[PDB]
Amino acid sequence: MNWTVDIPIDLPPLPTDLRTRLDAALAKPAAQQPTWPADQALAMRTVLESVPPVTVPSEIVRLQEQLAQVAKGEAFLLQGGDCAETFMDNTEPHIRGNVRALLQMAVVLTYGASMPVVKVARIAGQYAKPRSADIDALGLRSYRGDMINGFAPDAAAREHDPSRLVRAYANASAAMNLVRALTSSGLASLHLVHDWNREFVRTSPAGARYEALATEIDRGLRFMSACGVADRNLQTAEIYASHEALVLDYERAMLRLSDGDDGEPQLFDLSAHTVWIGERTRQIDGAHIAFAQVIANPVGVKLGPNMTPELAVEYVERLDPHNKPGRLTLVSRMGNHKVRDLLPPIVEKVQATGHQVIWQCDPMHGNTHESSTGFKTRHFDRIVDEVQGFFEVHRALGTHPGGIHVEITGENVTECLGGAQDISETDLAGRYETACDPRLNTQQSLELAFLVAEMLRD
Amino acid sequence: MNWTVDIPIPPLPTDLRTRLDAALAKPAAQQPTWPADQALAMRTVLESVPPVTVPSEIVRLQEQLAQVAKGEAFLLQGGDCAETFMDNTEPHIRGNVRALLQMAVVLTYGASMPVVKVARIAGQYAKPRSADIDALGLRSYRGDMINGFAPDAAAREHDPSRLVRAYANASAAMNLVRALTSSGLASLHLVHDWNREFVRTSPAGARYEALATEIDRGLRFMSACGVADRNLQTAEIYASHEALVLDYERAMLRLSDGDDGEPQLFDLSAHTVWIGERTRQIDGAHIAFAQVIANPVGVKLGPNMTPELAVEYVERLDPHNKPGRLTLVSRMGNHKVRDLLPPIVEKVQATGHQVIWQCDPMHGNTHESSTGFKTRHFDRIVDEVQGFFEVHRALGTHPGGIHVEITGENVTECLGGAQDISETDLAGRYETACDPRLNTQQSLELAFLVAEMLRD
Amino acid sequence: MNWTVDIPIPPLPTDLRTRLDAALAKPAAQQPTWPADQALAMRTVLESVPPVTVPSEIVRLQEQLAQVAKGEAFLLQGGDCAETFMDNTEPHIRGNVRALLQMAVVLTYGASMPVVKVARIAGQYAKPRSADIDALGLRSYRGDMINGFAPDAAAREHDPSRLVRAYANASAAMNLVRALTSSGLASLHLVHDWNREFVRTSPAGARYEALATEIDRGLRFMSACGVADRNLQTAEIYASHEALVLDYERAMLRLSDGDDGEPQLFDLSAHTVWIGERTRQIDGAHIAFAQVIANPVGVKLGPNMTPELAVEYVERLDPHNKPGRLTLVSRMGNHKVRDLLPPIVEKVQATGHQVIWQCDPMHGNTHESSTGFKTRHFDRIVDEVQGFFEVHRALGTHPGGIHVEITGENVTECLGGAQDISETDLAGRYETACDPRLNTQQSLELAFLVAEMLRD
Amino acid sequence: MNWTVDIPIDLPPLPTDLRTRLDAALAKPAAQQPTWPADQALAMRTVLESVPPVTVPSEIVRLQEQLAQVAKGEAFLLQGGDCAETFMDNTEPHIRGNVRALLQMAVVLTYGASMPVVKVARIAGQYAKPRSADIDALGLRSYRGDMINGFAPDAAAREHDPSRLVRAYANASAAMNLVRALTSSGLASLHLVHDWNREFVRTSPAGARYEALATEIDRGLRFMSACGVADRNLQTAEIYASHEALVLDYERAMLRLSDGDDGEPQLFDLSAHTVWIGERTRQIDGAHIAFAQVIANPVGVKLGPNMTPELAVEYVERLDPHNKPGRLTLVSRMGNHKVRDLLPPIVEKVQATGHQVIWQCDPMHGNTHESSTGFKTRHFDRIVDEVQGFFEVHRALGTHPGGIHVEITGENVTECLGGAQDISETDLAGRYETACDPRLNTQQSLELAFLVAEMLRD
Ligand SMILES: N[C@H](Cc1c[nH]c2ccccc12)C(=O)O
Ligand SMILES: N[C@H](Cc1c[nH]c2ccccc12)C(=O)O
Ligand SMILES: N[C@H](Cc1c[nH]c2ccccc12)C(=O)O
Ligand SMILES: N[C@H](Cc1c[nH]c2ccccc12)C(=O)O
Ligand SMILES: N[C@H](Cc1c[nH]c2ccccc12)C(=O)O
Numbered sequence A, D: 001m002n003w004t005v006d007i008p009i010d011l012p013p014l015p016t017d018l019r020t021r022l023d024a025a026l027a028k029p030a031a032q033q034p035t036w037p038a039d040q041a042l043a044m045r046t047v048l049e050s051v052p053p054v055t056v057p058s059e060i061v062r063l064q065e066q067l068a069q070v071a072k073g074e075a076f077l078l079q080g081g082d083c084a085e086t087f088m089d090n091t092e093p094h095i096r097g098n099v100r101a102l103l104q105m106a107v108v109l110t111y112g113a114s115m116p117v118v119k120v121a122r123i124a125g126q127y128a129k130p131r132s133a134d135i136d137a138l139g140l141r142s143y144r145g146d147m148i149n150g151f152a153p154d155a156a157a158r159e160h161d162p163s164r165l166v167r168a169y170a171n172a173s174a175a176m177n178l179v180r181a182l183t184s185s186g187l188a189s190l191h192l193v194h195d196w197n198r199e200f201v202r203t204s205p206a207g208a209r210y211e212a213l214a215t216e217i218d219r220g221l222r223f224m225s226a227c228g229v230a231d232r233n234l235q236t237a238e239i240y241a242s243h244e245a246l247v248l249d250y251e252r253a254m255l256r257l258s259d260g261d262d263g264e265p266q267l268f269d270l271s272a273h274t275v276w277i278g279e280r281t282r283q284i285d286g287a288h289i290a291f292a293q294v295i296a297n298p299v300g301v302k303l304g305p306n307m308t309p310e311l312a313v314e315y316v317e318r319l320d321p322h323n324k325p326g327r328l329t330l331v332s333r334m335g336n337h338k339v340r341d342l343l344p345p346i347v348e349k350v351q352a353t354g355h356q357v358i359w360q361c362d363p364m365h366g367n368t369h370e371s372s373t374g375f376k377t378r379h380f381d382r383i384v385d386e387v388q389g390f391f392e393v394h395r396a397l398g399t400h401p402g403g404i405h406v407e408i409t410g411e412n413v414t415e416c417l418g419g420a421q422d423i424s425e426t427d428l429a430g431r432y433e434t435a436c437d438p439r440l441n442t443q444q445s446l447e448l449a450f451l452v453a454e455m456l457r458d
Numbered sequence B, C: 001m002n003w004t005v006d007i008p009i010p011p012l013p014t015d016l017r018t019r020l021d022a023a024l025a026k027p028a029a030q031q032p033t034w035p036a037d038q039a040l041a042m043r044t045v046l047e048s049v050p051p052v053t054v055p056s057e058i059v060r061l062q063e064q065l066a067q068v069a070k071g072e073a074f075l076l077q078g079g080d081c082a083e084t085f086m087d088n089t090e091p092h093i094r095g096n097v098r099a100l101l102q103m104a105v106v107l108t109y110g111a112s113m114p115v116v117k118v119a120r121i122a123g124q125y126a127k128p129r130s131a132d133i134d135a136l137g138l139r140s141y142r143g144d145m146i147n148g149f150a151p152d153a154a155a156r157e158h159d160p161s162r163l164v165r166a167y168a169n170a171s172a173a174m175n176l177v178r179a180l181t182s183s184g185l186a187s188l189h190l191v192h193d194w195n196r197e198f199v200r201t202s203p204a205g206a207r208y209e210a211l212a213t214e215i216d217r218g219l220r221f222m223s224a225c226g227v228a229d230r231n232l233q234t235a236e237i238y239a240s241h242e243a244l245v246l247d248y249e250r251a252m253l254r255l256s257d258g259d260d261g262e263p264q265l266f267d268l269s270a271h272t273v274w275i276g277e278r279t280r281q282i283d284g285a286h287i288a289f290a291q292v293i294a295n296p297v298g299v300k301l302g303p304n305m306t307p308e309l310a311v312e313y314v315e316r317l318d319p320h321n322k323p324g325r326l327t328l329v330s331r332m333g334n335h336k337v338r339d340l341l342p343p344i345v346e347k348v349q350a351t352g353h354q355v356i357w358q359c360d361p362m363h364g365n366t367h368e369s370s371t372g373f374k375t376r377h378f379d380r381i382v383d384e385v386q387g388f389f390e391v392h393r394a395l396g397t398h399p400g401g402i403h404v405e406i407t408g409e410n411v412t413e414c415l416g417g418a419q420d421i422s423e424t425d426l427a428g429r430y431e432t433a434c435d436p437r438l439n440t441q442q443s444l445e446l447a448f449l450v451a452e453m454l455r456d
């Protein structure tokens, strides 16, 4: 009839002082919010206020410690996953593939950087997106991600449905459960992950190019074993969860109070470990920035080509008022043709504040174009070149190129042009599967890690 | 108040399909009565969801249960009698995880060997009933996977959407159990501090002070010897429930890769499951389903168990003689266990198979109070574990573990303990959706008492 | 019966040469009387030999002694009163190492904190004498570094070749101590098994059974919690002796590299040394020598110690306020310790320096038996440690350690203990070349008793 | 007067059954023995029978386990030190230097081999040597090593002096004490040792040649740390002690019985962990081979160019009668011009026995010549080439090139020609300090390790 099933829905409030501060923050204007009825939103938030959290505060405190090391130039941040997760594709094979692809990158980057890599997935919550246009090319209300409405090009599917708040949480908690299982039970074994990398080198069209570094890494691993390193710390990995904090109904409902066995109680957003604010919602006096101000999680802000040095400093002063290294990550996405010019005066001005942000490169979102064959796509070479320029900016300034933020999948999709597979405009039509932006496929994402490893090694 | 999910629009190896079909074609007791087409829709949803557990965890559990079977570890299994969707919250889950960990510390010290920790959690949403009409003249409550606790006819109708609600709640609970155990709740030193606070405040804490202090001095000894808090920071808590609703269990089957031997069916709704008294028909679907899955399994054994039938369970469910694959869960009643258990243990031991012998001291010791509550006396619960130990000591066999129903809540559900919970007291916080649980103090007191059994 | 060694045919920093010269120019008590030119030849040999210890070990010991001084570890120091060349054998060295380890296990459990293990070994070859003529009318025996034990005049002549014989024996003993401690003698589980055998066979083993079993259950708990035998397989035993013969100690000085701060003189005849009652003249060469070397040092404090003099030792020997650099070693007599120690501890604590307070319960409790033997009563030895603990408990200060004279041999040298060694018994195996030692059973019994003091 | 000092000398016997077997073995003829009086030898043996052992049996059992792994192709044996230790040069700086030089080699070989390296020093007992001629070029009785007589060209010094048995033990136990201290207290820290290697690359004349591999190793080490390997297993190293078992008075006096907490009591030679029998004393029916037969230690036999395949098999049958992998090491020293020809039929015949020996290359003792300027010397290139040929023999046969046995020192001596320093015949006169054969100096020994690492990597 509909080919759906309906699932029926049937504790103490947050402290009054923290709620008072939250309410003053959320009184600010919020861009890009769903347009569902307030009373229905309230009902769904009330459901979510009672569910088990996706993450817990001690994990977020640990992440914060590891991100402080990144900010101080003593680790590197890898952040990667789908552009937009869908409920339909939130499956074991797909989750496992994206976790594998992230781990494979991390091995190569760890060796290249000669320092720890903090692994943060875009996963278990990346279900909401902004739109510039409220009507899409089919004359429909725009798809806004599965937390808000449906991808299917159908008017009914596109109506904003607050029950998707609860479907999002179910999907997020189920995905996170599996990410925890996979990372603690042997998928994330260093030797197993490297074996996958060896197979990539064996079969890639440009594997000859990456053979030398792959063999080095292999000889590094075998050296560890030769020296009598026990495989204990090598058996499991930590993968943290992240998404864009966009739908404030969801994020506010997933706020919890820490139990104060750590230093004192505060608000954590336990929908994720770390979240970032996007280019379309980072209004300095808007609700998203004010929400980020109130929560204890590490946070990031996207910085595009219109960014000024002065506005960047404002973000730093609002979001890192206590000068905690790693609390704030500034995520540059300029375009490969602009990054070398636009980034330096922003970095200089922010460095002069005495604060220590993480400088992270997003080489995807500034390098998107439309193909002749009608697909939204990005060229691999432009993605690579923005990271190259980003490294050059930091090397010239003596600052730390702190990490990358990429959109990838373990699927063999045909979404970005180029790479060693030499994906063409024609090829795009084969497996163009993204519900939003074009992702690096599993080979392209690994090839990028090898290339960035060589940047790190210089 | 509906959320809504879409019904999704590589085949099993032929032999596994054949064997699964044959198992599920056998008669199955205690199944919900809902329409086949609606059940199919829900199963098709569940066949696509992320699993609650993964096969490598289950293989690890099997290794650790083999050590139990060989007399080199002890099995602690505990949690709610029935999880509810309403009470599937962070505080409640944290409390039950804490209560299990607290027990495990005391039992680990008492046993002088590792304790395998298995929660009744993230799936324990279905129960059998002897009668389909209850004392109020309603269709019986069968757990939140099947129908609703509320005493009205509409709530008690069997609703297949509860299959998917059960999974949602299970996966969210399991996520949190993983987080809590890897991120410091399960720190050995933190858990023991809770035990010290119990001794401080219990009415019979004087009784348990000496052993508590011994444990404390054992922990400090580790630190004194330069043991780093690496192995001590985190714990493994496995998930278990009664495999009852075969619509749910069959939909949560996944095929392993052939990285370990050959491809097998794992039930990834849990790490380990057990078959109950009312569904363990030797030629029934539940026992046959258990034969087809790779998980470690248990079978409840009540007072009508024969030595010969016990051997037949062993031979059907442990056909490859894999130590720890099968757990036999005695629940006899404290007045019967000493008499009924020995000839069952003797006969099974003579097979050359190595089962885990596990004591369930709850389900054989239930009575109704004057004040109308289903309850159990603490002293009878303790005494069945005592008798169980005596049976094994006399035979030279391994008293392998306990299976108890507990909660971290301060409920008033079982009589007695050091709090001396009375029939009157029961009315205060009788919160269980099914059987009476040991509250958090009673569960810890039981662990101290069983530690003293282990030490003798 | 001579082996023969050749006299070997970068200058100190000027300030260290100046300070060493000034120290050694001060008056030195209790020195051998042998010709300067012969002493010089021997020192020149010793200036070229491989050191018994190395500076990084001494820096590590200093770190571990700082933890003792801060109340976070306990110091066990024990071995022969006087090592002899004749008894410097594998069995004897192994026995004394075993006896020290056995004590350390019990004390570690009792203290609930790490025990720093320091043997009187690999150098303890020289002793002071109050009288230069002994009861037989001979020149007194002064230890094998100086002259011979045999009661005849020729053997008692001071012989500087014994300097080099002492080093040879020391370095050979230290080699073996290193081998034994890294290669399984010092395995925690093996050492505890020896303790279990003692409880099995001692006449008062019933008395110590409960604590022995507690310790056993503590060890098994570690294993149960999945502690790997990595940290448990090996132990560190440091070497110590009284720094008495300044010809020997000065020849065994080596200059550190400047990898840790600046170059310093280390005495590499040992890890730590102490200055005795008869050589601790505040303006004498021994105290000045101790000021110049980087090793942790101790000073013996007897019944005539004032609080003011104790403070002067602290200020001279710990001028930089480095916790654990100085150990003050109380030896008062069991009848005096409670009275004499408190005002010394109070005054020193008020300085803001953190010394190690260590009990030597032997040297203040020596008497002569009817049957002619120098002996000590076990009960008086125990009682001085008891009083020492009482002094510290009353003051809120740290009873930091003990310094005892023990052997792994079944000798008959100290009266009493559970064996009830009598005056008659003494004649059986009175084997010490100087003071009466606790035998292997008495030394272990003492550790059990001091563990109970630690537990109160 | 003499410029010496005299040191005066002042327990249950070994079991009667073991002594009976020992006496039957030592009844055999023994070559190259000192000629001191029997009654004086007996007195000195009686002294030594009572001294603390240099090594203990549990260490030797552990070595045997690690050598079994070498024999099975899963580890590599490095054995190195002075040709002849002297008492005069048995000092802290010299011992420390030789330990450092061995460790430096081991790091490079571990990385190159991608498997553990068993580190065995020629040290703490290498005090005795054979001679072909009983009169030397000065018309004196030949120097036979400090255990027997004195190096000084003086008739009195050259008389065989049994008190040197006890001086040898004193020196051995003092050296071993220090080797234990150094290896457990931070000299043997992996990172510290590698830093020395970095400094060598910085300053060697051919450091450009070895820079790439040095940097690889550095990046391997930093990878370990990046992956969160704790520096516990990396802080200390095991260095075992070895010498040629030549003077049977010494070796027999240092026999001890194991305490039988291991499987059963037997005779261990506790003067060392492992000993070998030389080319001049390996008579198949001689006392040295029979002594090696009776002791439990791992043992080696030198095989020179006159070796037959049949005699090699005889050694295997006498010395490894229980087919214990690693118990026997066969140490080829052929000459670089002969090894490729002479070794293969020996390896083939021995492999066919079903026994697993360690095949170890001694590239020194077959490659010695006299310079025009009068010095006994070896060319670096010939030393390297014999190891090269040795590897080629094993690669062709599918057998395991199991290790090397070299004569090295941490001193900057001028004893072997060539290397990157290009040591000439003229240069030899500068620091020719060996009491017997020419050693690789500290730079040459490290350069050899780099070159053999490249052999391992092929
Ligand atoms: N693909 C998902 C299926 C899903 C994930 N978590 C839950 C929880 C409860 C029911 C279904 C699911 C979906 O379409 O939501
Ligand atoms: N486990 C040690 C690691 C090590 C420590 N120092 C060194 C020096 C050279 C090689 C290795 C090591 C080992 O592999 O022996
Ligand atoms: N206690 C839960 C609340 C809830 C609603 N949807 C989900 C999804 C996943 C976990 C929990 C929940 C209930 O009433 O079902
Ligand atoms: N880390 C060691 C543990 C140990 C090993 N053997 C012994 C013997 C006695 C006491 C302790 C130990 C240590 O704590 O010294
Ligand atoms: N007990 C020793 C035996 C001995 C003789 N020379 C040495 C050298 C090193 C150690 C011991 C010995 C003694 O009588 O001196």
Ligand SMILES: N[C@H](Cc1c[nH]c2ccccc12)C(=O)O
Binding pocket: B101, B102, B104, B105, B108, B114, B115, B186, B187, B188, B191, B231, B232, B233, B234, B235, B236, C224, C225, C226
């Ligand atoms: N390896 C863990 C140690 C541990 C950590 N937390 C707890 C709580 C209760 C018992 C033990 C542990 C283990 O033994 O399970």
Ligand SMILES: N[C@H](Cc1c[nH]c2ccccc12)C(=O)O
Binding pocket: C005, C006, C045, C048, C049, C050, C164, C165, C167, C168, D087, D088, D089, D090, D167, D170, D171, D174
């Ligand atoms: N160079 C050494 C010095 C030596 C080494 N060990 C001992 C023991 C006793 C006396 C001297 C030495 C030598 O010439 O023997």
Ligand SMILES: N[C@H](Cc1c[nH]c2ccccc12)C(=O)O
Binding pocket: A103, A104, A106, A107, A110, A116, A117, A188, A189, A190, A193, A233, A234, A235, A236, A237, A238, D226, D227, D228
């Ligand atoms: N301690 C882990 C090591 C590790 C395990 N799996 C992976 C995968 C990719 C990189 C590293 C690791 C860590 O460094 O995160």
Ligand SMILES: [Mn+2]
Binding pocket: A083, A084, A365, A407, A436, A437
């Ligand atoms: Mn995107």
Ligand SMILES: [Mn+2]
Binding pocket: B081, B082, B363, B405, B434, B435
């Ligand atoms: Mn129940």
Ligand SMILES: [Mn+2]
Binding pocket: C081, C082, C363, C405, C434, C435
């Ligand atoms: Mn004394």
Ligand SMILES: [Mn+2]
Binding pocket: D083, D084, D365, D407, D436, D437
């Ligand atoms: Mn040589």
